Amino acid sequence: AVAESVIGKRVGDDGKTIEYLVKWTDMSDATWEPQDNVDSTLVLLYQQQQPMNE
């Protein structure tokens, strides 16, 4: 339950993403990365993929 590891999306960080998945460095499968701008620092990046507008 901390901001450390974040690497989960339904695709790659190139130009064809699909969905958000957040994975911590202790309890994998927490919240979400891509469509999840509830951080703006660790997610927004993996969300660079997702405009966070669905």
Side-chain angles (χ1 to χ4, degrees), residues 3-53:
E4 292 297 275
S5 180
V6 280
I7 51 183
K9 327 198 310 303
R10 284 288 295 276
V11 215
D13 59 270
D14 290 90
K16 52 178 180 178
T17 187
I18 287 169
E19 219 177 277
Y20 56 1
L21 300 171
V22 144
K23 292 85 176 58
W24 296 127
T25 187
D26 185 277
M27 299 179 59
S28 61
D29 180 87
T31 313
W32 332 98
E33 274 310 81
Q35 188 207 148
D36 244 61
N37 183 215
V38 192
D39 189 63
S40 306
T41 175
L42 295 179
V43 199
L44 171 64
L45 306 183
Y46 299 87
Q47 155 207 334
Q48 75 191 329
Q49 307 329 141
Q50 309 288 30
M52 178 251 178
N53 176 214

